[PDB]
Amino acid sequence: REVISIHIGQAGIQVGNACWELYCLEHGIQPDGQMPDAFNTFFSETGAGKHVPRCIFLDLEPTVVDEVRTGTYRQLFHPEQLISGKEDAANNFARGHYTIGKEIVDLALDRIRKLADNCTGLQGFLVFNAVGGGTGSGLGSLLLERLSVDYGKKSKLGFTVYPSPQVSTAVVEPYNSVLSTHSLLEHTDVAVMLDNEAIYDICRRSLDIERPTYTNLNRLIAQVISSLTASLRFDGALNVDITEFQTNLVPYPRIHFMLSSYAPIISAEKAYHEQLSVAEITNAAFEPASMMVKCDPRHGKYMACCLMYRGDVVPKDVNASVATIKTKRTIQFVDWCPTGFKCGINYQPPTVVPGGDLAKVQRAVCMISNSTAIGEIFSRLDHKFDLMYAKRAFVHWYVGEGMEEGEFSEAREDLAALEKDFEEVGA
Amino acid sequence: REVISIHIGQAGIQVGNACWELYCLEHGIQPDGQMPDAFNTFFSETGAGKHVPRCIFLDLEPTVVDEVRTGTYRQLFHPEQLISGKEDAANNFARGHYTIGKEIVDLALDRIRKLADNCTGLQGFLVFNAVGGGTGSGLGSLLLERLSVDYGKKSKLGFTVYPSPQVSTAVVEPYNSVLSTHSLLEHTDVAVMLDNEAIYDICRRSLDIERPTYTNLNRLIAQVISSLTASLRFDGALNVDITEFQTNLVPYPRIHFMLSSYAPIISAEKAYHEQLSVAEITNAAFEPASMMVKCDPRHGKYMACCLMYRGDVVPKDVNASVATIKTKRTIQFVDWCPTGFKCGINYQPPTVVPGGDLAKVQRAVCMISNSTAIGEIFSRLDHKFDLMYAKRAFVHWYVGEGMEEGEFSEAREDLAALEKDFEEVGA
Amino acid sequence: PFAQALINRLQDEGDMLARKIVLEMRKTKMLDQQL
Amino acid sequence: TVPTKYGELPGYQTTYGAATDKMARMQADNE
Amino acid sequence: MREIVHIQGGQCGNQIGAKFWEVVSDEHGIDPTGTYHGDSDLQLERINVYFNEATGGRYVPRAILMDLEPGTMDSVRSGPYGQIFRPDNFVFGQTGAGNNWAKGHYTEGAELIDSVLDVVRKEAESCDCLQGFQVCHSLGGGTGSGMGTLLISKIREEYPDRMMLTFSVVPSPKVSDTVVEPYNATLSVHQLVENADECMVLDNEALYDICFRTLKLTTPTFGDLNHLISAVMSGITCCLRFPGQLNADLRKLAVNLIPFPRLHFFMVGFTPLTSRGSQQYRALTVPELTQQMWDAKNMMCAADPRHGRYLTASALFRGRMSTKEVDEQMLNVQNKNSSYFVEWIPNNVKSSVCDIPPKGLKMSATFIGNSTAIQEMFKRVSEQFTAMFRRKAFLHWYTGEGMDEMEFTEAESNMNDLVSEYQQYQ
Amino acid sequence: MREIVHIQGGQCGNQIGAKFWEVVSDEHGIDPTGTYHGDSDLQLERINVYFNEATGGRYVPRAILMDLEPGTMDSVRSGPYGQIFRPDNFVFGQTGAGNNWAKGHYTEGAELIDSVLDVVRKEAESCDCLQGFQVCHSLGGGTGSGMGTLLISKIREEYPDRMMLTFSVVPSPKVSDTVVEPYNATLSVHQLVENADECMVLDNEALYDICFRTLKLTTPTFGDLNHLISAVMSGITCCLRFPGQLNADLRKLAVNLIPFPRLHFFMVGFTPLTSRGSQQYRALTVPELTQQMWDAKNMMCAADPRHGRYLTASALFRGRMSTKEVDEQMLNVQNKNSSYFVEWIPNNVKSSVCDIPPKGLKMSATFIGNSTAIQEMFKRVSEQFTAMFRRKAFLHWYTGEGMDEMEFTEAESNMNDLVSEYQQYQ
Amino acid sequence: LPLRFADVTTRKHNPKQQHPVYQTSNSIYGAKAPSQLDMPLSYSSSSQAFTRAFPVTAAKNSCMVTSVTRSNV
Amino acid sequence: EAQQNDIKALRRELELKKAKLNELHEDVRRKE
Amino acid sequence: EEQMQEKAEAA
Ligand SMILES: Nc1nc2c(ncn2[C@@H]2O[C@H](COP(=O)(O)OP(=O)(O)OP(=O)(O)O)[C@@H](O)[C@H]2O)c(=O)[nH]1
Numbered sequence A, B: 001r002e003v004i005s006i007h008i009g010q011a012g013i014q015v016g017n018a019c020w021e022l023y024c025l026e027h028g029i030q031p032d033g034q035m036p037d038a039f040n041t042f043f044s045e046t047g048a049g050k051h052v053p054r055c056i057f058l059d060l061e062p063t064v065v066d067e068v069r070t071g072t073y074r075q076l077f078h079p080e081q082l083i084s085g086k087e088d089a090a091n092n093f094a095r096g097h098y099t100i101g102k103e104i105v106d107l108a109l110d111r112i113r114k115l116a117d118n119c120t121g122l123q124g125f126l127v128f129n130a131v132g133g134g135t136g137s138g139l140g141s142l143l144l145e146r147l148s149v150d151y152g153k154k155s156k157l158g159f160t161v162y163p164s165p166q167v168s169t170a171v172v173e174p175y176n177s178v179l180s181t182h183s184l185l186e187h188t189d190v191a192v193m194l195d196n197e198a199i200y201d202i203c204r205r206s207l208d209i210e211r212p213t214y215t216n217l218n219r220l221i222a223q224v225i226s227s228l229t230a231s232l233r234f235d236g237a238l239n240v241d242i243t244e245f246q247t248n249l250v251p252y253p254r255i256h257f258m259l260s261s262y263a264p265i266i267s268a269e270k271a272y273h274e275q276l277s278v279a280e281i282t283n284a285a286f287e288p289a290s291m292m293v294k295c296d297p298r299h300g301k302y303m304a305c306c307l308m309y310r311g312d313v314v315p316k317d318v319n320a321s322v323a324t325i326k327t328k329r330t331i332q333f334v335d336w337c338p339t340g341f342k343c344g345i346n347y348q349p350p351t352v353v354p355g356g357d358l359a360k361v362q363r364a365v366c367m368i369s370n371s372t373a374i375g376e377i378f379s380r381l382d383h384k385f386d387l388m389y390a391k392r393a394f395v396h397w398y399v400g401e402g403m404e405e406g407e408f409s410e411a412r413e414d415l416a417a418l419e420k421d422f423e424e425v426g427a
Numbered sequence C: 001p002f003a004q005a006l007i008n009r010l011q012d013e014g015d016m017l018a019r020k021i022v023l024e025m026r027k028t029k030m031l032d033q034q035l
Numbered sequence D: 001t002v003p004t005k006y007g008e009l010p011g012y013q014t015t016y017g018a019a020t021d022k023m024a025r026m027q028a029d030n031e
Numbered sequence E, F: 001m002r003e004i005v006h007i008q009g010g011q012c013g014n015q016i017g018a019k020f021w022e023v024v025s026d027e028h029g030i031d032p033t034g035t036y037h038g039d040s041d042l043q044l045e046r047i048n049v050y051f052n053e054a055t056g057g058r059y060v061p062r063a064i065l066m067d068l069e070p071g072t073m074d075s076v077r078s079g080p081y082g083q084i085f086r087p088d089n090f091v092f093g094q095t096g097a098g099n100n101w102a103k104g105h106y107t108e109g110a111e112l113i114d115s116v117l118d119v120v121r122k123e124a125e126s127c128d129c130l131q132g133f134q135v136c137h138s139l140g141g142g143t144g145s146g147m148g149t150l151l152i153s154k155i156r157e158e159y160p161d162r163m164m165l166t167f168s169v170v171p172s173p174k175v176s177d178t179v180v181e182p183y184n185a186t187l188s189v190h191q192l193v194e195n196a197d198e199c200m201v202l203d204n205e206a207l208y209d210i211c212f213r214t215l216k217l218t219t220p221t222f223g224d225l226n227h228l229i230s231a232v233m234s235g236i237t238c239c240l241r242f243p244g245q246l247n248a249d250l251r252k253l254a255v256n257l258i259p260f261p262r263l264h265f266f267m268v269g270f271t272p273l274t275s276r277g278s279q280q281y282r283a284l285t286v287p288e289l290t291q292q293m294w295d296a297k298n299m300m301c302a303a304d305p306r307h308g309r310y311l312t313a314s315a316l317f318r319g320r321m322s323t324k325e326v327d328e329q330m331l332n333v334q335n336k337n338s339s340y341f342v343e344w345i346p347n348n349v350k351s352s353v354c355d356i357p358p359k360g361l362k363m364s365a366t367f368i369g370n371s372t373a374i375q376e377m378f379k380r381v382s383e384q385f386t387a388m389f390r391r392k393a394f395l396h397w398y399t400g401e402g403m404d405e406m407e408f409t410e411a412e413s414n415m416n417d418l419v420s421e422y423q424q425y426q
Numbered sequence G: 001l002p003l004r005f006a007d008v009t010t011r012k013h014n015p016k017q018q019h020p021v022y023q024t025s026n027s028i029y030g031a032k033a034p035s036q037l038d039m040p041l042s043y044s045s046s047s048q049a050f051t052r053a054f055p056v057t058a059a060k061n062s063c064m065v066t067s068v069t070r071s072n073v
Numbered sequence H: 001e002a003q004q005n006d007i008k009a010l011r012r013e014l015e016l017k018k019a020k021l022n023e024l025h026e027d028v029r030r031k032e
Numbered sequence I: 001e002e003q004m005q006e007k008a009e010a011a
């Protein structure tokens, strides 16, 4: 059983820069790539005494790529898995979809082809990209399209960074996000939303860092991925695989948008503050102070929830905890499913990266849920899309590349039909 | 079992200069001529503690022969076998076949005659020459002619240098190529050709050497030659001899022209990168990214194939690999040849040369195959032949030597007849 | 090519084997009365 | 390798000897 | 003589059976390396039922493991008593169905079930006199539900004249692992009512309750639950492996317990199960055993029997005891709580006694009840099924694979007609 | 008494013979220096069948190695049990055939065959009562096939009354080592049908598949394959070399397996072949050997025999065993799958028992089946031969040496009438 | 616990060293030394050796039924 | 490849039918 | 590794 990880965009390779580090420091491999079976899902052992990840970084600017090439993980990633372009799309969907994609994604797909050929028990894929930029949006969708015409039936977990409503770095992000969602609606089988503000609130309140940078963000995101992949990396008492989000989490072929959260997010001294058990993290998994996506689930109703447990976790208390949650009425489910829970238990608790602010916990929970809160977020992004579309802002650069208003119009009609679908299942 | 190697023209002797270098480094022979049984096929033991190769370098210009005489291999290459003329034929088939050939060929033939008398179990001859020049073409064919009237039934392996279509260093080279092939049709039993651009593409792409010299070129060529003579030099699990290429690779008495390829050409860091095994090199020996001849075999249909394995290799997986190829349909065979493979396995792996850019491998594959791909290349050569033949270009030099138009028209009609045979064998 | 005739041969053989099965079933169905 | 049992070797037991074991034993006892 | 083959499907079946073979080997005194080390010779004469002698005291279990994910196989071979199974019997796929009954019954079944059918066929023929087959699996998972379902159908098609048990845990709303639990349950019950001879319904909720009240365990992990289930299974099959004053084989149990061919879902109990603190303050008599048997809270199902009537019941006792005391105890318990027993059937209790108790105790009991209260559990799941099927939620992963809606409607009709006949006989 | 002289041709024949004399030497207990050091003198009484005593107990194999390339001889003398051959018997050319049947049958035979005929004659009248000859060679290569073929013809012309075994490896499209496989194989069998008494067909594909499934070995070098074929050859000659309860000599098996003079091609299987990890979990009985014998994935040919009918069959057993069990097992496998056998011959199975097992085993068996499934292989060759002959490709290398067209036509004819009579008797 | 987890001193970590003035944020990642305390307490790995030993998943059924009839009399 | 798949299904079907025939014949003999 | 060290010495 193996799952491979693909990284498109500056956010993609930076989180992967955190992921694979956390991975080798999870399996005790030095950054040079040699040990001084659980790695088999991510690491293939060339010869003996050297392990290469089942991964690929690819970007358009050569700066951060060569920065990885000259960093400390020179020997870990082998010097051809790092694909690099010449010039950026500069936050342009069409520039990342039509101009440079026809040159880069073909090399990427025949690379990932032999990567899959080298692999034996490929379970699925998982892609890292942020829809706010032009690199991760354009050719990531194209790569996902071409991988769908290549395999299609294999699960393609998309952990995409969504832009915050109030916190914004660029201006064309609603354009790129909607134009990417046009294809992610049909290509991605299970997509996971990730805002940055909610994680900013997390590091402000719980992790109590007053000057946060992308490093700690990428580190915790990596810990989220590690927590959801630990069921395959190690044996647990009750394990679930990557094809479980296929059945358990997606009730309709287009309602695939899941709310992510991770707990307990605890600093060094707060572990002294707090006695860690199961009931409080089961609770803390639901309050909006611990979610990764800015929304208010009190106004939404849950579709289906999944709970990943790492560490010394007996099933009796999680059963009592979900019992208490189901008899409580502060949160409400939808009438479509009486049993909206999916529990999964693993033996290995998460480890600590040195230099991080998270202490070693005896147990952790990774909660991934589905609700209509995301149905409210999509209308919030479409309001900002229509605010700039009504005055024809930034259309001329897409037309200068060669695109038209037809794809913009159908993208607007698809998102509106998607809003109708969320509210329909909400009723 | 013994074979001697002769090197006609400029090109062949740098091939030999790297070739015998690789041989003495393979058999542990210092360049003074002595070690501090497998050498029997190439080296004869003079007195005690000395070995001389069954080889003759022969050129018309004295400067590069003197380079061999005064290089590092002054004591290895013994000072009389290195035949040298006085003036070059200067890219002229007629001046190399008729003017000075009548003085050089006799000296060469009775030189190799006594070399054969020193030999006991001669398997055959192998020639290194370029047909684009004048020295390799003219007397090279004259030698070949006089070898055929001398022995005839013994095998003559011609590892010639065929010119690249687009990149070329000469002007009369298509005249020289056609006028050599016209005799190489009925002189060589087995003629293996090496384009140079293909070697350029291989070192550019795979070896990623941005500045390739002819030394590296010849290092790779010698690597090919050593990989095909390893069956004679060292015992393997399944050996092949020089006499088999007539029966296995030549379906018709004039269609004897073979596609040559090698795998894996891998740099030092890329060997650290990739885990080399049988399946990928079995695949790698089939794309035009690894061929020594610039042509697209997808446009052609293979007649027969030959696959030499060196090193850590068992027959099980090579039989599994060729099975996958035979059930694949991206590469098609001719309908007259269901069993189109000649495989062989030798135990000893190919060695490295200090100063070279190759790393040692656990296993390597050398492919020599026949297709209709050459059926296209010979038409591409005959076309550019006719473009300058239509206006009588550079023919007065041949007439000034003493040649006429009759053999030009006959060579044109013979090569056209070989083309009809190529089409007739393609269907 | 040759598989095209072989599949015909195998089809005819399968039909013949079904024809044999019919007679054998009739034989045992007759013997169960005599028992 | 093959170690010896009190009576015979493990790997090698012919049917004739298997039939005449008791007669051979009685003959040895009488001797 | 009498032969029982064992099949473990899915992760639940594999771990439970793992503890099952541990308890079995311990009762027969076989060490984890596979050689006999017991003392009494009563164990030697009755191991042909569960084992085969290979070479000099080395016994191999007569079991078949079947799954789709190698982690289960690793957890089987890693634990104690793991190195005893025959590697041929590890017939095993590679992809994984993953809580998808359509994948468990149409996708990987076609290329895995023929193979496991051959292994079973070889093990069916290796023995002489088949008594029955014994399957253990879950109902919420995919690789256990559909696989075991189709395997049961095929086996019943091939060997219809042999007994068949299946120990299947059913989902509960409070203890709920996956979300398509009704989708799997109603199709599996629809097949098991038409193919399986009788099943023993289990549930994690009642087991968790048992470990909280009676066992008073602090952290009852899955090992102890499987220990309870395995202890129950050994209590079922002790009659074939040991002598007694009144033997009762598997077919003898089914005929005494099944009045009509569709009424074959039993709720099970085990006795004694007392806390380790109060093990000293108690007594060991048959009335002491009986009052612990007939308790509703001692049942291993989430169905209150005092909410319905008992159709038939059976009690398998182990140890030296007085049969008169057993019988008068069953008569008294049938006369006191007379309303809870059905009226038009006299002698609703079958009883059997073996004179070999399990190791560690003096006298044990196993209760098998065919009551009508199980319709509450089937209602509890069918209403969730209709709650999803009323607006076709989560259906498309099964529709797109080949399965259609009519199968669901059949499942509904079959569930409803059975609970209707349970209510009818009530 | 009865004598078997050995002949090895070509590279494969040499390596096969090397492993063959290795295991036979280990079977008779002689050291690689040529002196006896074994245990039971049951080994001594029948070493004359394979050895001649030189000076002070120096037993040399009565073998003749022959090829055209010295590298094969070096690989022979390299490994152990390579210093026990008489260097006179290394009769050996110098030029090399190179996968050319014409070179191996008209050019090189003209100067090598009188020499090998000298050696084999001296080796023939050296012993008293010749039983027959044993040949190990190929049909794809040049120096083995052609030279051995002409040698067989000469020998059968000189000694018409002695028996003859031919172990010949045939190619397959999946494992196609050389290109002219049909050109050589067709002509070879076209001579074998009139010269050889019987032929035991081999191949590498079946061996690879056997090491895939049954052995679970990682890297199957040629040594293990030759080790299997060698175990086969020791099994087929076990009857002469050891006493038994029912001895079946070479001529005895031939007369039981050959009902028609042109129907003398056999397929072979060897048992037991089990992986080392699963070697511990098995019992060792005659049914255990029988289940592996009649497995169609255990033949050493690429002809799945259940696509045709067994004409006749033979089983050679080694080890102390019940003849009753032996026969009733043969009766059962013949009565159940009765359609797999021919109808107009009752008792299609000839059995034999020898008392001495191969070293390291309790009980072994060698199966030799004369089935009509081999016609699938020959048609699989002839269609390739006709496909090439229609285009006359690679034909000039043959016609330019002395061969003409009508030889190829008669090879086609004999191929076609052979498969026609096979299809007839099916 | 495997040896590499039991002891950190045995796993050599060399961080590419950077000019103090000259320090990009992506270099923060792999420049920090692990310690015995960061090492986890138990490494519950999963041995796929027994499963790798198993052959290709494509099995077969190729036998002739040979069961002595054992009617129950 | 298509005819190859057809062959590998048809052969399996024929084999199942042949096994059924064998079973029926054995039963006939026992009943006789 | 020795080849890589030779690369470093050449550079
Ligand atoms: N959490 C987090 N988000 C990041 C990080 N880096 C980039 N992003 C996200 O990426 C979005 C902008 O796109 P970039 O990743 O900077 O660049 P790009 O996606 O390659 O697109 P171009 O700049 O046009 O080439 C921002 O809105 C961020 O949300 C990071 O390190 N951490």
Ligand SMILES: Nc1nc2c(ncn2[C@@H]2O[C@H](COP(=O)(O)OP(=O)(O)OP(=O)(O)O)[C@@H](O)[C@H]2O)c(=O)[nH]1
Residues within 6 Å of the ligand: B008, B009, B010, B011, B012, B014, B015, B088, B089, B090, B091, B092, B130, B131, B132, B133, B134, B135, B136, B137, B161, B163, B168, B169, B170, B196, B214, B215, B217, B218
């Ligand atoms: N690969 C390779 N090809 C070479 C080398 N040297 C010469 N050639 C080929 O030789 C061709 C020209 O002929 P030369 O070898 O230079 O000289 P020649 O064949 O003796 O003929 P003259 O120039 O008349 O003396 C060129 O087109 C090259 O392709 C070499 O070192 N390596």
Ligand SMILES: Nc1nc2c(ncn2[C@@H]2O[C@H](COP(=O)(O)OP(=O)(O)O)[C@@H](O)[C@H]2O)c(=O)[nH]1
Residues within 6 Å of the ligand: A237, A238, E009, E010, E011, E012, E015, E016, E098, E099, E138, E139, E140, E141, E142, E143, E144, E145, E169, E170, E171, E176, E177, E178, E204, E222, E223, E225, E226
């Ligand atoms: N008693 C017990 N039940 C288990 C265990 N693991 C899972 N289960 C039950 O199995 C049900 C889900 O079955 P699942 O594990 O998905 O089976 P599978 O996927 O088909 O192998 C849940 O209701 C769990 O209660 C275990 O170790 N012990």
Ligand SMILES: Nc1nc2c(ncn2[C@@H]2O[C@H](COP(=O)(O)OP(=O)(O)O)[C@@H](O)[C@H]2O)c(=O)[nH]1
Residues within 6 Å of the ligand: B237, B238, F009, F010, F011, F012, F015, F016, F067, F098, F099, F138, F140, F141, F142, F143, F144, F145, F169, F170, F171, F177, F178, F204, F222, F225, F226
């Ligand atoms: N089993 C086995 N087969 C071999 C061996 N060597 C060659 N072969 C087979 O022999 C065939 C080629 O024989 P070849 O060497 O050309 O015979 P020769 O050239 O006449 O001596 C191939 O198809 C191989 O499968 C070996 O060592 N063992």
Ligand SMILES: [Mg+2]
Residues within 6 Å of the ligand: A009, A010, A088, A133, A135
């Ligand atoms: Mg960017």
Ligand SMILES: [Mg+2]
Residues within 6 Å of the ligand: B009, B010, B011, B133, B135
């Ligand atoms: Mg020159």
